[PDB]
Design a protein around this nucleic acid. Structure first.
Length: 96
DNA sequence: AACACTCGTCGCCCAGAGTTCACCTTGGAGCCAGGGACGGTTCATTTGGGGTGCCGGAAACGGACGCGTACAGGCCGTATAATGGGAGCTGTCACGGATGCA
């Protein structure tokens, strides 16, 4: 029941993430974003998918919020040499 | 084939099984009288405790905001000479009528 992808190890019940034994504390928004990324490993998720699921539907603001959060997650857990959370321009994001 | 003995069966006669019929007692079953203490109730405390609204403020956190970079798509130009397509395969018939020629 432990969510995994190679380096990243996310546990829902205890609510923190490991990088091969390296825990880091994340904000709730970014935590939901990372969780609902990891459960969709290798699959493209578009911006409406991201906003409707991680954020509530009634989010009436502009989209770059997810851009900033993906930047946060990249500088936090992608900070290893290899790049996992890749971006497909005009489509979305995939962790792979 | 001739001859002289011992055993059920019944009645009868006297004593009690045990049953009825029929006499005295005495532990009552309950009925009431009297006296707690008692547990249910109620009401005085009693301050031990729950409680809280707001903040100085410390720190996360959510996002705006400005400014860099990134391929995607578009425009543009290449100076020896290079000057009129391959290919299509066509076994129908009926037949009304226009139609280009009669």
């Amino acid at each position: 029941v432990r969510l995994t992808f190679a380096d990243i190890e996310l546990d829902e019940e205890t609510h923190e993430v490991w990088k091969a034994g390296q825990p880091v504390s994340l904000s709730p928004t970014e935590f939901t974003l990372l969780r609902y990324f990891v459960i969709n490993a290798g699959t493209v998720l578009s911006k409406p998918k991201i906003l409707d699921h991680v954020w509530r539907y009634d989010f009436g603001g502009d989209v770059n919020v997810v851009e900033s959060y993906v930047s946060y997650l990249r500088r936090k857990i992608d900070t290893g040499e290899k790049r996992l959370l890749h971006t497909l321009r005009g489509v979305g994001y995939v962790l792979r």
